[PDB]
Design a protein around this motif. Structure first.
Motif, PDB file in Angstrom:
ATOM      1  N   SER A  59      41.519  35.683  56.208  1.00  0.00           N
ATOM      2  CA  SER A  59      41.796  35.768  54.780  1.00  0.00           C
ATOM      3  C   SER A  59      42.570  34.111  54.708  1.00  0.00           C
ATOM      4  O   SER A  59      43.659  33.920  55.492  1.00  0.00           O
ATOM      5  N   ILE A  83      42.841  50.688  53.442  1.00  0.00           N
ATOM      6  CA  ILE A  83      42.736  49.467  52.701  1.00  0.00           C
ATOM      7  C   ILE A  83      42.032  49.520  51.525  1.00  0.00           C
ATOM      8  O   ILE A  83      42.223  48.676  50.657  1.00  0.00           O
ATOM      9  N   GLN A  86      44.499  49.973  48.617  1.00  0.00           N
ATOM     10  CA  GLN A  86      45.546  48.754  48.225  1.00  0.00           C
ATOM     11  C   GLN A  86      44.430  47.514  47.796  1.00  0.00           C
ATOM     12  O   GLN A  86      45.077  46.885  46.854  1.00  0.00           O
ATOM     13  N   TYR A  87      43.302  47.601  48.168  1.00  0.00           N
ATOM     14  CA  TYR A  87      42.361  46.530  47.644  1.00  0.00           C
ATOM     15  C   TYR A  87      42.300  46.602  46.165  1.00  0.00           C
ATOM     16  O   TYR A  87      42.281  45.326  45.318  1.00  0.00           O
ATOM     17  N   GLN A  91      44.115  44.209  43.832  1.00  0.00           N
ATOM     18  CA  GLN A  91      42.753  43.327  43.392  1.00  0.00           C
ATOM     19  C   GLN A  91      42.693  42.138  44.238  1.00  0.00           C
ATOM     20  O   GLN A  91      42.497  41.214  43.683  1.00  0.00           O
ATOM     21  N   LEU A  92      42.725  42.170  45.602  1.00  0.00           N
ATOM     22  CA  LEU A  92      42.464  41.220  46.508  1.00  0.00           C
ATOM     23  C   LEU A  92      41.210  40.308  46.104  1.00  0.00           C
ATOM     24  O   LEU A  92      40.306  41.090  46.284  1.00  0.00           O
ATOM     25  N   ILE A  96      35.725  41.723  50.956  1.00  0.00           N
ATOM     26  CA  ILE A  96      35.658  42.642  52.031  1.00  0.00           C
ATOM     27  C   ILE A  96      34.306  43.314  52.364  1.00  0.00           C
ATOM     28  O   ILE A  96      34.269  44.069  51.147  1.00  0.00           O
ATOM     29  N   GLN A 101      34.797  48.598  56.599  1.00  0.00           N
ATOM     30  CA  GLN A 101      36.153  49.575  56.809  1.00  0.00           C
ATOM     31  C   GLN A 101      35.863  50.326  58.155  1.00  0.00           C
ATOM     32  O   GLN A 101      37.233  50.788  58.648  1.00  0.00           O
TER      33      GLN A 101
END
Length: 160
Positions: A59, A83, A86-87, A91-92, A96, A101
């Motif tokens: 990242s 994850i 949180q994503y 809004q990463l 991914i 996962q």
């Protein structure tokens, strides 16, 4: 008499004064739908839950670590599973893979207090309980078929 004639005197005012106790719309809750399955291992109600931090090397924004509360008895596999929640919340932008996962596709490697990568230590996963080492920080390490095959060998993958 020195006081009230009746024994054990007290104020009259029951808590359930209202006929209904704030009826809920429809099974509404602060927990997310997905969180139902995952939050189960988050030990939200457990104040003894182990904290965990993440630092992906691939990242470009490692300054955004993942902070979650996990039980002392749940395996690492649950760590990454969160994850997803949180994503959406953060809004990463970094893309991914969905299959990433699972620990079978990628491996989790421990890091120093400086965030340095430790190649001398093994990569914890579903087979390696998070509370085993008692560390609240980890990193995502690339795994190939050779390493993946060995990782699933110890822990056979259950059919969906």
């Amino acid at each position: 008499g020195p006081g009230h004639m009746g024994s054990v005197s007290n104020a009259k005012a029951p808590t359930s004064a209202l006929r209904a106790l704030l009826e809920h719309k429809e099974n509404s809750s602060q927990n997310g739908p997905l969180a139902e399955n995952f939050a189960t291992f988050s030990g939200h109600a457990e104040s003894n839950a182990l904290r965990l931090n993440i630092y992906f090397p691939s990242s470009e924004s490692p300054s955004k670590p993942l902070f979650v509360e996990l039980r002392k008895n749940v395996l690492v596999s649950e760590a990454i599973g969160y994850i997803l929640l949180q994503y959406v919340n953060q809004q990463l932008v970094p893309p991914i893979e969905d299959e990433a996962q699972n620990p079978n596709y990628w491996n989790l490697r421990i890091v120093e207090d400086d965030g340095e990568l430790d190649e001398d230590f093994p990569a914890l996963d579903r087979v390696g309980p998070l509370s085993k080492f008692g560390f609240d920080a980890f990193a995502l390490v690339k795994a190939t078929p050779a390493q993946i095959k060995e990782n699933q060998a110890a822990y056979p993958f259950k059919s969906k």
